[PDB]
Design a protein around this ligand. Structure first.
Ligand SMILES: Nc1nc2c(ncn2[C@@H]2O[C@H](COP(=O)(O)OP(=O)(O)O)[C@@H](O)[C@H]2O)c(=O)[nH]1
Ligand SMILES: Nc1nc2c(ncn2[C@@H]2O[C@H](COP(=O)(O)OP(=O)(O)O)[C@@H](O)[C@H]2O)c(=O)[nH]1
Ligand code: ALF
Ligand code: ALF
Ligand SMILES: [K+]
Ligand SMILES: [K+]
Ligand SMILES: [Mg+2]
Ligand SMILES: [Mg+2]
Ligand SMILES: [Se]
Lengths: 160, 161
């Protein structure tokens, strides 16, 4: 089973992958379009094996390699059993993904389950942990500090 | 499985070989130098021998910050390999001995580490496909793009490891 991390550039997807995999699998920098290739890591939580999949931040890109990466990101989404929609919490106060980026949500395969991840809690000062918005699971965490990531782990085990 | 690290100059065809070995389009391939920066890992089996095939950023003095980091990571993979496939673009040099091609690369490798020299783009150079030896190193001529000579590589990996 496959969990895809997807969202805008610099949301912290690669930072999250590395937190979940417990190794420095993906390059992380503040440059949008750092990740282009699809990065896949095998993990387990508690008897449950899954593939965690990091992808290029979604946009209309003039960088050819990044454009290909973005096409591949959408292809990963097509095959996902769950998507983690990573959001830079510093960029917006909205919590409902329909307010955050309605085109992304509308484009997702029908009934692919979505978890909304508001990252960079360390900057915003948001309360860490889980809640629900319009029926979507919502988690506030810091991929950089690890603060809140166990709540993501338990969530994956319970939900899938 | 044992770690086989694909290393060499940019555009040699490293990702093209990863994809040929893995039997899927795991890495992005383009005519642009510095396409791969992140380390890519593909687990495969050759006649029931498992192997971890590792693709890396082409080694150069890169201006791009992420490519520079990818190049650092490439040397970290090399340091920890069980074997290195030294990928050489046959269209850019007729030298076959790695000591003539890039002595600094060869000298920097960990003492015990076996290397297989791979002369890619045989479809272009018209080099005869298959296996030979240069200064004690296995030397294989193949084309990652057409797949010609890749079976020779798979067989060598099985026999040698
Ligand atoms: N303060 C803070 N910065 C973060 C966090 N997660 C990621 N970043 C930073 O945001 C930038 C982009 O992160 P990265 O994982 O490359 O984003 P990606 O493009 O979505 O994969 C980097 O400078 C990270 O250090 C976080 O939880 N807190
Ligand atoms: N004709 C030919 N072209 C190749 C071969 N292998 C790779 N290429 C081309 O060389 C360019 C670079 O390939 P790529 O795999 O991205 O090289 P890398 O940067 O070393 O990973 C691309 O245009 C490939 O299609 C080959 O065996 N024959
Ligand atoms: F902008 Al990125 F991985 F660097 F989505
Ligand atoms: F130049 Al490359 F992977 F694009 F080594
Ligand atoms: K980034
Ligand atoms: K390339
Ligand atoms: Mg990234
Ligand atoms: Mg490559
Ligand atoms: Se693996």
């Amino acid at each position: 089973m496959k969990v895809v991390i997807a969202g805008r550039p610099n949301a912290g997807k690669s930072s999250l992958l590395n937190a979940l995999a417990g190794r420095e699998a993906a390059i992380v920098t503040d440059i949008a379009g750092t990740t282009r290739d699809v990065l896949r890591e095998h993990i387990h939580i508690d008897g449950m094996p899954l593939h965690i999949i990091d992808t290029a931040g979604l946009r209309e890109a003039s960088d050819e390699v990044e454009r290909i990466g973005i096409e591949r990101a959408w292809q990963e989404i097509e095959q996902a059993d769950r998507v983690l929609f990573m959001v830079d919490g510093t960029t917006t106060d909205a919590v409902d993904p329909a307010e955050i980026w309605p085109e992304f949500i509308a484009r997702l395969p029908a009934k692919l389950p979505i978890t909304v991840v508001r990252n960079k809690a360390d900057i915003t000062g948001e309360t860490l942990g889980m809640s629900e918005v319009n029926g979507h699971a919502l988690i506030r965490l810091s991929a950089r500090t690890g603060e809140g990531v166990d709540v993501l782990r338990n969530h994956l085990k319970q939900s899938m």
